[PDB]
Amino acid sequence: MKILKDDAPELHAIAAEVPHGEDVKDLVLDMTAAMTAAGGIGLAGNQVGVLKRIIVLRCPTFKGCVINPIITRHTDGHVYSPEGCLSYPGKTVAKKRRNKVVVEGYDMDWQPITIAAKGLTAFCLQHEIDHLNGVTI
Numbered sequence: 362m363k364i365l366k367d368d369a370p371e372l373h374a375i376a377a378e379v380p381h382g383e384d385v386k387d388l389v390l391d392m393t394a395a396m397t398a399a400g401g402i403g404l405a406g407n408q409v410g411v412l413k414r415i416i417v418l419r420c421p422t423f424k425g426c427v428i429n430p431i432i433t434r435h436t437d438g439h440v441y442s443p444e445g446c447l448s449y450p451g452k453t454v455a456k457k458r459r460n461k462v463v464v465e466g467y468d469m470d471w472q473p474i475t476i477a478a479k480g481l482t483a484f485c486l487q488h489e490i491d492h493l494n495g496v497t498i
């Protein structure tokens with residue numbers, strides 16, 4: 362895979378729900394490989410031109426994939442999160458993020474998963490889910 366150029370339309374497009382049970386194992390392997398090759402701690406389908414709701418992470422309290430991730434709970438107000446993005450190398454943006462989130466979805470074997478995250482890991486989850494909605498830093 363390749364991390365798309367900063368002017369790619371896919372970065373602003375909405376990623377489609379993955380049909381329940383679809384085999385995404387190779388896709389997740391490829392995405393994880395693209396993420397680590399580019400030196401990132403997360404990656405979303407849009408960034409590699411895959412308009413499917415899949416994210417991969419290697420963050421302090423969560424490492425792995427989430428299929429069809431959704432934020433089901435978050436803290437009120439916002440905190441400071443300085444973020445760069447692999448799709449826009451060179452740029453760091455002071456983002457407002459929820460300090461804590463719960464994300465739910467499925468793993469590669471279609472088992473339901475729940476991730477309770479705070480700080481950096483919460484920021485990563487929000488950053489990647491944003492990508493799936495075509496929202497970038």
Ligand SMILES: CCCCC[C@H](CC(=O)NO)C(=O)N[C@H](C(=O)N1CCC[C@H]1CO)C(C)C
Nearest residue numbers: 401402403404443444445446447448484485488
């Ligand atoms: C921080 C919220 C999630 C950031 C995820 C990005 C990767 C990305 O573009 N995902 O879509 C990353 O690894 N960004 C790094 C990044 O922003 N980091 C890594 C350490 C913490 C934070 C810098 O404040 C670098 C490459 C810019």
Ligand code: NI
Nearest residue numbers: 362363364395
């Ligand atoms: Ni490649």
Ligand SMILES: [Zn+2]
Nearest residue numbers: 445446447448
């Ligand atoms: Zn990004």
